[PDB]
Amino acid sequence: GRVRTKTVKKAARVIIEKYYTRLGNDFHTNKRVCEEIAIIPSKKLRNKIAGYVTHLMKRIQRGPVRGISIKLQEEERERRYVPEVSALDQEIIEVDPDTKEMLKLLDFGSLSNLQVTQPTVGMNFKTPRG
Amino acid sequence: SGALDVLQMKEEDVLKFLAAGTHLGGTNLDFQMEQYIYKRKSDGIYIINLKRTWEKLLLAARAIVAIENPADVSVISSRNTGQRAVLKFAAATGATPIAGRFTPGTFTNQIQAAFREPRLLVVTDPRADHQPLTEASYVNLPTIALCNTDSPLRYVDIAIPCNNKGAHSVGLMWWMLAREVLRMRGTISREHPWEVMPDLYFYRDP
Amino acid sequence: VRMNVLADALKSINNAEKRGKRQVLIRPCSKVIVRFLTVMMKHGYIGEFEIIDDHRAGKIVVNLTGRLNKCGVISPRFDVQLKDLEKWQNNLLPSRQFGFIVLTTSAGIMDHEEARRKHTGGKILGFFF
Amino acid sequence: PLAKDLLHPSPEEEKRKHKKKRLVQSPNSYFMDVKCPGCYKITTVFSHAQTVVLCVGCSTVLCQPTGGKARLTEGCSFRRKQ
Amino acid sequence: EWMPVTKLGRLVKDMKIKSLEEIYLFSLPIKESEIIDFFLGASLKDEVLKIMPVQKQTRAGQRTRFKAFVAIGDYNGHVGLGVKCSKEVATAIRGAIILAKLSIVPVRRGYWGNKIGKPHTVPCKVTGRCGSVLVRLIPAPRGTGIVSAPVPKKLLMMAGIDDCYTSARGCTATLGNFAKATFDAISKTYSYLTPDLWKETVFTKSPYQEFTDHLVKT
Amino acid sequence: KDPRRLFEGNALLRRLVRIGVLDEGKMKLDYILGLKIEDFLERRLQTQVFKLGLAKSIHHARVLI
Amino acid sequence: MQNDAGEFVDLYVPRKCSASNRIIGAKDHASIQMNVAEVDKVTGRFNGQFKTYAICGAIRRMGESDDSILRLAKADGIVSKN
Amino acid sequence: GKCRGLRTARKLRSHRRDQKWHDKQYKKAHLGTALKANPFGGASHAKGIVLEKVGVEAKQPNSAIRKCVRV
RNA sequence: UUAAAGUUGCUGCAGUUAAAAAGCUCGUAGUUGGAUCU
RNA sequence: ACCAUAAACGAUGCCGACCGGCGAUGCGGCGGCGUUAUUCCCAUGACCCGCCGGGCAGCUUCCGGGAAACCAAAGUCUUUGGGUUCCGGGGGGAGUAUGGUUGCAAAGCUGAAACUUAAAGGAAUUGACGGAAGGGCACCACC
């Protein structure tokens, strides 16, 4: 089979976590940047690493990769977002009657944005055990 | 928040709490968490008293401000719904974030380069982050956590009673704790609202 | 059935002091128990308590300051002569520097150090340290 | 737990316990004051009554006894004393 | 050369911590033995108690390893007890010496009768317990010496107890359970709350708090 | 303040002071527990003959006596 | 602790748990010492003082360290009533 | 558990002196059958007439002939 | 023969699996017995 | 009609107090939105949400034990005393012989000694085995 051992994958992962800006989606460009950054002996190891770097940079664009740093993997997504109004800036907030009793003890019964919905009338919230 | 008019919960904070859903707990109730519940309504969901969520948050903020070097506080979320709010708590505050899997032996194995020695531990969920809780009982490390109604309170020392299942509630709690620790320090004033919108902390999934 | 009602109260405030609790409810109260607790409080081991009046028998809510290590009864109440007091405090007490043995003497219920001072023997109720 | 005021429970908490497990025990019963609809007499009735109480004027039943609490007849208005 | 890796070893090496009693007061865990070598050092003596060969059966035969039980102690001071297993007896003994330095506790000493002089015995009756073996230390008057078996006598004399009464129970032929049981009793002498320890504890700053401005330069 | 402790506690101290094993200023009953074997072995006549310059070893003194 | 002449004959005086008065031992690695910051009562900013609470490891393994911190801080007026 | 009351002295000592007979050392030295089976009759030494020299064979995990005497 | 033997145990042992708790209930002696009176 | 004996087993005296949680279930009682049936109405029945009290169980836990397996009792034990019954004292000889006693009898209860012996025994851990059951692999196996 073609299963890459942990030498290839370890060196590829630490090159990803150190040089995410220099890398891309082409194999042959990543082949050239690893051979100047890293001191790698005989050529068959340099080629196997750079293929995993290409296959790994393909996968980071689609979401998370568990082997590499979270801080970097999340930050790139952010860098690669502001909504114009906040999701917590609502006009109608639907609360229960029991919630409004809590706000009444919080002396916040004088809120305008509340809309006291009625709760459902059936007391059914458990699974029919058996 | 010792009966000070400067520190009382205002109207907009209550509106954000109600919009995010941080008052609605879970279906079950731990016996250690019974102190913070207003009442269980119908549909079996417990309502968290927001006056006690606000005062436990203000007590945790004093515990974070009482540490001189701000990098000695560590902030931990091992599930994805709180991984973004931890990384922005540490950029606004100056703490040390640990997102993703906590390595067993981060606090006790002193040989490794993964070894850290914090002075305070803030945790997004005491059930999901069970491993950094138990390791704090080896190195004399106090612990703040965001606790739901079913959360166990073994080794938590300040138990902020919020909702931590929904993605908006976690981000709002981390945002409001960041605002409180920055307000209690010498930086941003209590007059104007904070520049950071609280949607920088939410976890928008795909 | 419940015999030796003082053995109940001393086991209750032993088991609650181990659990770190602040208050114990012991029931039923008795006048032997109140005089035992008064000896412990005057040497600093428990703190104030409130006797609750039911018309049947009391209950006592004792406050706990976490200074108690062990509170025990001795059953049966052996007769203790004043020459025999040293063997009892060799067996029961953990040190010659602290701890007390509670005797019922005919001058009242008192600790073993006061009973020597009043030059009195009696019967043993228990011990605390 | 571990710091709970045993001297002063809340009044909705002593109401919840069993009647002998309270701080000072007290019964769950009361004396109602049953009015017969087709009469004028007002009768003192125990709430957990055994054998069936007859208003001696109208000679009609006021409460058939049950397992726990005496079940009134249809239309007998009652108030609880003190 | 000692290049310390913990926050505490960097404080110990830079003369910020003046005694082992500060680390004991704040109950900080000690992960480097060079802290102990820095503090006690020239007055710290060790005794090998038993070299114990243990055997695991394997597919190829059986591996024999060797278990060393090393008690270390500063006489008048502190006492520790380390156990290390290895395939070689010299490395087992050196690792048990490190592990015995690492687990060093203070022992509180008291008076039998009136408090005239320096403390000489245990403050009260303390029982240690480890795997069926019960060891009980009873306070003795000035000058009786240690009245014990020859195994707890080593640890007790290394701890600095002048004179004590002892009573054992269980299967004391197992020298491991009989050494760690008395070590559990010696380590209980500070955990016992006696009436002289009844005052309110004025708190002081932890070494990670007071030297937070020195620790950031490194 | 017991009479046996005051009476036999003072005879026992007087004998130790008299044969030179205690000190005069150390006449409380608790210093008896701080006595050692060598304090009694100093008061043998053999060691006194050696220590007063009559002999020239501890073995010349026994054979002199 | 003290002899008859009055010297202090003790290596160190160990701390006590602020919730339950237990002696925090030398190898009690679950025990806590925690500062809670004090604020100025007109700006709500960190004064510089704090309030130290120590809690032993058995209280924290019980799960009772949250309530104990809460009632210690409530007695100092750091957490207001209710 | 055992009785503990202030008037239990007859129950305590009649139980101990009946459970004392279940000990091998007490039953041997207080019954009298073992003394009647002892050929010395309780003496430390005795005297006899040598009847014959006898070679007794050692028990299994070693091997020799022990030189005994029937007396 | 005594200590060692907390292997006779009142102080002071043990009885799920190492020796060991009665098939079950009744029940005399014995043992033990709730508060309460300056 | 006698016999009265069992892995008669929770392989676990009885009575009493204290000591963690969690959800079910059985019975009785107390409350509570709302579904159904008795045409309405209460009153009840079937459900649903609780609470209280005893019960049969279960899950869970650094309560504390214990040689450990395990145990919310097998905990509150060298910090050893709540009350009380039966019963054990290294392995065999042997529940054998004899005596007494009940029973028609089988059997029941009671029950030794001489002598022999340095171990027998309990938990747990690593390996060893197959004519136990499941997986992976090799043209020095097969197809």
Numbering used by the authors:
A (entry chain S): 2 to 81, 84 to 133
B (entry chain B): 2 to 207
C (entry chain W): 2 to 130
D (entry chain b): 2 to 83
E (entry chain D): 59 to 276
F (entry chain J): 66 to 130
G (entry chain Z): 1 to 82
H (entry chain X): 2 to 72
What did the authors write?
Once inside host cells, not only does the virus hijack the cells' translational machinery to make viral proteins, but the virulence factor nonstructural protein 1 (Nsp1) also shuts down translation of host messenger RNA. All observed ribosomal complexes displayed the same binding mode of Nsp1 to the 40S subunit, in which the C-terminal domain of Nsp1 (Nsp1-C) is rigidly bound inside the mRNA entry channel. Our data establish that one of the major immune evasion factors of SARS-CoV-2, Nsp1, efficiently interferes with the cellular translation machinery, resulting in a shutdown of host protein production.
Structural analysis revealed 40S and 80S ribosomal complexes in nine compositionally different states. The Nsp1-bound 40S ribosomal complexes could be divided into three major populations. The second population comprises unusual, pre-40S-like complexes, in which the cytosolic ribosome biogenesis factor TSR1 is bound in two distinct conformations between the 40S head and body. These complexes do not resemble any known on-pathway biogenesis intermediates. The stable association of Nsp1 in the cell with multiple different intermediate states of translation initiation besides empty 40S ribosomal complexes is in agreement with the proposed role of Nsp1 as an inhibitor of translation initiation.
